[PDB]
Design a protein around this ligand. Structure first.
Ligand SMILES: NC(=O)C1=CN([C@@H]2O[C@H](COP(=O)(O)OP(=O)(O)OC[C@H]3O[C@@H](n4cnc5c(N)ncnc54)[C@H](OP(=O)(O)O)[C@@H]3O)[C@@H](O)[C@H]2O)C=CC1
Ligand SMILES: NC(=O)C1=CN([C@@H]2O[C@H](COP(=O)(O)OP(=O)(O)OC[C@H]3O[C@@H](n4cnc5c(N)ncnc54)[C@H](OP(=O)(O)O)[C@@H]3O)[C@@H](O)[C@H]2O)C=CC1
Ligand SMILES: CC(C)CCOc1nc(N2C[C@@H]3[C@H](C2)[C@H]3C(=O)O)ccc1C(=O)N[C@@H]1[C@@H]2C[C@@H]3C[C@H]1C[C@@](O)(C3)C2
Ligand SMILES: CC(C)CCOc1nc(N2C[C@@H]3[C@H](C2)[C@H]3C(=O)O)ccc1C(=O)N[C@@H]1[C@@H]2C[C@@H]3C[C@H]1C[C@@](O)(C3)C2
Lengths: 409, 409
């Protein structure tokens, strides 16, 4: 009687996001869907026990089945190394998975009509992605004690040098970088595939720098792959591609209506943080998806962390108000991609239905505390203005069952 | 009967900004001030005739007299090389002057109450500066044909190597950089001196990058020079200093009231453009000042170009509506700095009076076309909504004479 969903790689997480992960699976997914679920436990304890092998196994699983949904994990530091008595300070799992699959991360904010945004003029979505390290890119730096010269060199592997400074007085710091064309091509392919997947135009952002020969490369690569492999595909989808230099891109974007993909490029180390900033809107309403340049493999993930403070409240038995939208949308976007790969329209209908239910619920006046403060301001919110974690999950469950019952008339 | 203003280095410019430069000097300055004016003509023709020597002479003059006011010039390109039949494609004069004096450029928008700003929540000024090349900094880049390895090296001048990639398949692009501590110290000193000169707090913005050893240097240098040479100077001025990473700085700034100095740092090639963007507000209301790390030498300049299109209209005898505020404020800020160096309070009173007159005039409803459109929108402005270049200059003249006559009762 349930829907046959297919094969999905699951990755479990830590702390509060773990609690809510199991809530979602028990209340919103399994009652209506039957899955071929390949579950990997990326909790800090298990990762320590397997010496981080479980992370790699999960990554390869995603490489095999093309669909992965991940719960927020912990990136250990010294403090954590003490808390759990870890063997090593284990690397961030997100970076490992990303390095294995080789895609690009794109982040998005879920829009509700009664939730104010950073710019009031924004109506439509905005989806942002950065070209970060990993790769096939890498870099290095070091300090310089005193007078000397720093020079760069290149030794061809098949049978055969510049200068950056010959300074005299004073010390300093030197740095060198390399960037394969492959990472540029993968970044471009992933961007185009994302814009086609969403049906929005694509803008590429770039700085004006002294590194001219390097600046022109991103240009010519994006533009060429476009002219050769996506011109007509974009024509048929009524979307387009353009380049902007970021100084203009930011201003123009701030007085646009939204509705575009933003591929951000800084001609240096951008790195890829596990989470997005903090002051651009509620983090519970922000998602991320890792898209590979082949357009077939996808990893869905909440764009925030494990919410440690709330977990501390939960351990001591106190009332929490944690926003589950981002994780829910990890599940719904994963399942949606599954449906596209399988041409399973039941699954697609269910996923879009669950997203509609979440947005409708919040817009009807039922929300967690973070959104209530987002409306009024935290020094003005009262208890009657919001619902706790479990209350909100129950509300979502009710409204979902209702919508599905209506659809079956 | 006029005010004795002292020594001021003047630099004349090109095209429309030149026309308006002479208007300002004849209508707003010389009737009330008597100067020891060292005039250098940086018009494109003279720069070509002197092989750009006049630019250097001017720069040294500023080094001697500590005060320079500059009109917008032309940075020639191929087209210009044809238009004026130039010998070479002469370098931007602003870059030459800046390289000789060794300061930092700071940009600001003149606030009027009836002129909408990029963010409505902004009440107070915001003053922005970037750490750019020149120096003592420099960089380099180049393409890589195929398999090989790129490595960086450092040869000490006093008696004695890393690796950035050993890639196999594929070509790419490599790059190297160096940054003396001296440019960092000069950037910091200039920033602190600017915040003290204006009476606003100072925030330093920085990225999160893989170049860790290089990232910590800016940190420790700024913080140390602060702890040693400016802690009590900032205490007495009721201002403070803080660091932000730009991801948070942008968000927090967008919902602040303004009123701070913003020292922007990107761990790579920022370069220094002659002009600021375009979509952050009317360019006629934007200024720039070059401040040297010694806190004594200053160059005032409009933050826009020569306005070539308007000049084309003027050549053909058509009505123009060019905004003179930025240039006026170059004069007023130059004179103000002169007054501070000489403890000449007459001059300071006159400068602040002229700024007050400009702002009052615009706020009273008399403005050029760019601001009228800034209020309504260009498809809605009529001729009755604004005044042409000469009309507006005459209005300013009247209001200035009035204010001065009032002050003498
Ligand atoms: N694997 C991953 O994808 C990520 C993992 N992490 C891990 O997350 C853990 C904690 O990171 P942290 O620094 O706490 O950043 P978090 O995003 O985990 O929480 C940060 C703050 O943002 C607000 N917030 C975030 N999500 C929600 C939500 N769903 N509902 C309500 N408020 C929310 C809360 O503010 P308030 O407390 O004011 O309500 C919270 O304290 C660390 O161990 C880190 O390693 C970090 C980033 C992502
Ligand atoms: N030495 C310097 O400080 C600088 C020199 N330049 C030189 O300036 C010349 C032209 O540069 P350009 O690209 O035209 O940029 P400009 O700043 O000279 O003019 C650009 C546009 O901005 C608007 N604008 C700027 N200033 C005003 C003003 N005072 N009143 C009204 N509108 C204004 C106009 O838009 P609209 O036409 O829509 O009204 C104008 O067409 C070039 O030769 C360049 O080399 C460039 C930057 C600074
Ligand atoms: C347009 C400008 C006000 C810059 C906005 O910047 C960001 N906006 C985000 N959104 C988009 C919008 C919110 C959340 C979503 C929505 O409401 O629908 C998410 C992340 C960044 C972000 O990290 N931006 C950084 C920063 C702004 C630019 C881009 C990038 C790098 C940079 O150096 C320059 C600092
Ligand atoms: C706060 C964010 C919306 C970024 C704003 O950015 C800028 N605002 C300017 N103002 C300040 C404000 C207007 C004009 C004046 C006023 O109205 O009083 C002038 C220049 C830039 C600018 O060039 N910013 C660029 C860009 C925004 C950030 C800083 C910098 C580099 C970056 O990569 C990141 C792109």
């Amino acid at each position: 009687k349930k829907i046959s969903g297919g094969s999905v790689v699951e990755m479990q997480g830590d702390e509060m996001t773990r609690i809510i992960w199991e809530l979602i699976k028990e209340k919103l997914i399994f009652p209506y869907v039957e899955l071929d679920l390949h579950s990997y436990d990326l909790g800090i304890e298990n990762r320590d026990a397997t010496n981080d092998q479980v992370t790699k196994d999960a990554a390869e699983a995603i490489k095999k089945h093309n669909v992965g949904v991940k719960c927020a994990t912990i990136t250990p530091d010294a403090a954590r190394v003490e808390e759990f008595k870890l063997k090593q300070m284990w690397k961030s799992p997100n970076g490992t998975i990303r390095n294995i699959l080789g895609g690009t991360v794109f982040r998005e904010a879920i829009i509700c009509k009664n939730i104010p945004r950073l710019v009031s003029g924004w109506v439509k979505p905005i989806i942002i992605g950065h070209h970060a390290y990993g790769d096939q890119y890498r870099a290095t730096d070091f300090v310089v004690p005193g007078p000397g010269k720093v020079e760069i060199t290149y030794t061809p592997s098949d049978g055969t040098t510049y200068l950056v400074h010959n300074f005299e007085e004073g010390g300093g710091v030197a740095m060198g970088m390399y960037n394969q064309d492959k990472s540029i091509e993968d970044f471009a392919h992933s961007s185009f595939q994302m814009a086609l997947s969403k049906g929005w135009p694509l803008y590429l952002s770039t700085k004006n720098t002294i590194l001219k020969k390097y600046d022109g490369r991103f240009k010519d690569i994006f533009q060429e792959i476009y002219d050769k492999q996506y011109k007509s595909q974009f024509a048929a989808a009524a979307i387009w591609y353009e380049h902007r230099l970021i100084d203009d891109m930011v201003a123009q974007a701030m007085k646009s209506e939204g509705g575009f993909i933003w591929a951000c490029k800084n001609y240096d180390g951008d790195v890829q943080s596990d989470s997005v900033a903090q002051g651009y809107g509620s983090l519970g309403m922000m998602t991320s998806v890792l898209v590979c340049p082949d357009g077939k493999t996808v990893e869905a993930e909440a764009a925030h962390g494990t919410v440690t403070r709330h977990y501390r409240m939960y351990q001591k038995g106190q009332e929490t108000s944690t926003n589950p939208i981002a994780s829910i949308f990890a599940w719904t976007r994963g399942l949606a991609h599954r449906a596209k790969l399988d041409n399973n329209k039941e699954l697609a209908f269910f996923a879009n239905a669950l997203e509609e239910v979440s947005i409708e619920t919040i817009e009807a006046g039922f929300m967690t505390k973070d959104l209530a403060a987002c409306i009024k301001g935290l020094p003005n919110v009262q208890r009657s203005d919001y619902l706790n974690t479990f209350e909100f999950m129950d509300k979502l469950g009710e409204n979902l069952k209702i919508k599905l019952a209506q659809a079956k008339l």
